[PDB]
Amino acid sequence: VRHIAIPAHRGLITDRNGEPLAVSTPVTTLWANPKELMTAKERWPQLAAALGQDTKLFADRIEQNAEREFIYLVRGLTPEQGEGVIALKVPGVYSIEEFRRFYPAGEVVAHAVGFTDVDDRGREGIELAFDEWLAGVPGKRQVQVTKNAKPGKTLALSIDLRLQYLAHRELRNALLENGAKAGSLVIMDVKTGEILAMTNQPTYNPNNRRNLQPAAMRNRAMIDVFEPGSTVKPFSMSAALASGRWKPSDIVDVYPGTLQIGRYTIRDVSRNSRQLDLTGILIKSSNVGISKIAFDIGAESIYSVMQQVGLGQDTGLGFPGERVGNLPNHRKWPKAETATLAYGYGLSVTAIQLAHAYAALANDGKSVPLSMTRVDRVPDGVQVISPEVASTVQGMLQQVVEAQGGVFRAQVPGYHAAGKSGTARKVENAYRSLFAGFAPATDPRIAMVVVIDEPSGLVSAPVFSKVMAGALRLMNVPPD
Numbered sequence: 001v002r003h004i005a006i007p008a009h010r011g012l013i014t015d016r017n018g019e020p021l022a023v024s025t026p027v028t029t030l031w032a033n034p035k036e037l038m039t040a041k042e043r044w045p046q047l048a049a050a051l052g053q054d055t056k057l058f059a060d061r062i063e064q065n066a067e068r069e070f071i072y073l074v075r076g077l078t079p080e081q082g083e084g085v086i087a088l089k090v091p092g093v094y095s096i097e098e099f100r101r102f103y104p105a106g107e108v109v110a111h112a113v114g115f116t117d118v119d120d121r122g123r124e125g126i127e128l129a130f131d132e133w134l135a136g137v138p139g140k141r142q143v144q145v146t147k148n149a150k151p152g153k154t155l156a157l158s159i160d161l162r163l164q165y166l167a168h169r170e171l172r173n174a175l176l177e178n179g180a181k182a183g184s185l186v187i188m189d190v191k192t193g194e195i196l197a198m199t200n201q202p203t204y205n206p207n208n209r210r211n212l213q214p215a216a217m218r219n220r221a222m223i224d225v226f227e228p229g230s231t232v233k234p235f236s237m238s239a240a241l242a243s244g245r246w247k248p249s250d251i252v253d254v255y256p257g258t259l260q261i262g263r264y265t266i267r268d269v270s271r272n273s274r275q276l277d278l279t280g281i282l283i284k285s286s287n288v289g290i291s292k293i294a295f296d297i298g299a300e301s302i303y304s305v306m307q308q309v310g311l312g313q314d315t316g317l318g319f320p321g322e323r324v325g326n327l328p329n330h331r332k333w334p335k336a337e338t339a340t341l342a343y344g345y346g347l348s349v350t351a352i353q354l355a356h357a358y359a360a361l362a363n364d365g366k367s368v369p370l371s372m373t374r375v376d377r378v379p380d381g382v383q384v385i386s387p388e389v390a391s392t393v394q395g396m397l398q399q400v401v402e403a404q405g406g407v408f409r410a411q412v413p414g415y416h417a418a419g420k421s422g423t424a425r426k427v428e429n430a431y432r433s434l435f436a437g438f439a440p441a442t443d444p445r446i447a448m449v450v451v452i453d454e455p456s457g458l459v460s461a462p463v464f465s466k467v468m469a470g471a472l473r474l475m476n477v478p479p480d
Contacts, residue, residue: 003140007096008136008139010152011154012154013113013134016194016374019104021105021113021157022101027098028082028083029096030051030085032073033069033094036091036092038092039091040091043088051073075098101127105161105164111199113126115127121135122135124219128320133152134153137149157374158192158194158371163471163474166474167198171201174463180452181454183453184198184220185221185351187355188358191445193368193369194375195372202215219319221451222315225323227348228348230343230420231422234282234420235357235361236343240294242386243296245297246296247278249278252275252278252289254289258271261291261336266339270284285420285421294339302341306357307327309360309384310360311349312325315370316370317352317370325347328346344422345425352449361390361394364391365385366383369381394438395441397418397441398418401441407435412464415472415479418444419448424451433450434451435464439472443480446472446477450467
């Protein structure tokens with residue numbers, strides 16, 4: 001008396017509206033009892049042909065495995081083609097009925113959904129992350145069914161497939177139009193912590209993984225870590241405005257675009273300024289300007305805001321090889337390390353962490369935990385920046401996009417947007433174009449990060465413009 005497992009049907013993955021993203025499809029896996037197959041040798045050439053395998057290769061395989069009470073013949077055969085084998089009616093041939101995944105949206109949501117292995121177990125993305133929820137529990141057969149298989153449970157992602165398609169298309173076009181290698185785009189609901197879209201390029205078809213380059217499989221949004229540069233200056237400014245020592249109309253002299261701190265010299269990307277107000281320091285991305293404010297308030301206040309918005313912290317999503325990056329801490333913050341933290345070369349983050357930090361600022365200073373599954377009851381979340389500072393910083397970022405001298409290519413057709421461009425350094429000196437922002441600026445709903453590796457706020461900003469316009473409309477957000 002022997003036992004054999006009854007495979008359980010893997011749970012359906014849908015997007016947030018019930019659109020199917022991963023579905024367990026019927027297939028048949030033919031095994032055989034060699035010792036039985038060894039009594040029907042004159043059938044072998046027809047079995048071989050019908051199995052795709054080749055006559056002598058097939059005969060060799062069966063002969064050497066003549067002891068084995070059991071061997072597979074083939075996995076994954078369609079159930080109708082698979083009868084064409086049991087239609088030859090060869091002795092020794094027994095069939096198992098099995099499920100295999102199909103991915104109806106294919107390459108569009110490859111990295112977010114991921115895929116299963118040959119054993120129907122999660123290997124990447126959500127398939128891995130919720131493998132236990134989706135897998136259910138195999139059954140048992142001896143005589144009797146000693147245990148009935150329980151089916152895996154349905155899972156509704158936070159992803160909106162309409163926004164994911166728009167993000168996938170617009171990022172793809174931007175990479176060809178800027179001869180760029182790779183890129184990421186993350187869209188978040190700033191109220192719910194939901195990831196509405198996460199697209200990486202290059203992508204792959206999880207329904208055909210034969211010619212699959214490890215480069216295409218890379219979930220860049222959650223894995224690539226970089227120095228966020230000027231895109232974290234809003235968090236430096238949040239610390240400045242919470243200090244009691246700074247208001248937006250305060251002036252800093254940044255002439256002549258350089259600042260010597262001991263042996264080190266801080267050097268601005270544009271060196272045509274003397275007096276700048278705090279908004280101008282952001283618009284110009286003056287490192288001298290943000291450095292002088294950081295020296296006045298202390299790195300500790302900046303470190304604390306960056307920590308509280310989740311920069312360099314575990315996201316809690318449970319995706320495989322999610323990287324945490326690095327928010328370095330000190331007892332004693334010297335001038336050099338204080339400055340480099342304040343203008344964003346003093347830490348490294350992922351696109352997902354950056355978008356989550358921009359969500360907190362956009363959600364009037366309240367952090368909500370990230371979710372890759374549909375949120376029905378919003379968590380309470382944490383007031384990490386006062387609503388008043390958050391409001392002030394939002395208005396500063398709206399000026400960055402829409403003031404004279406600002407990033408005009410991020411302006412969003414129909415709405416007022418807010419955000420900041422940056423030049424990232426990978427973590428031997430690789431460079432990415434960043435844009436981080438949210439909209440609508442006065443009443444934010446969506447936060448977005450665009451990352452474009454090695455293009456060969458002119459590059460990332462127009463992508464943000466186009467994906468944001470489309471996202472706000474698909475979500476029936478009213479024009480301001």
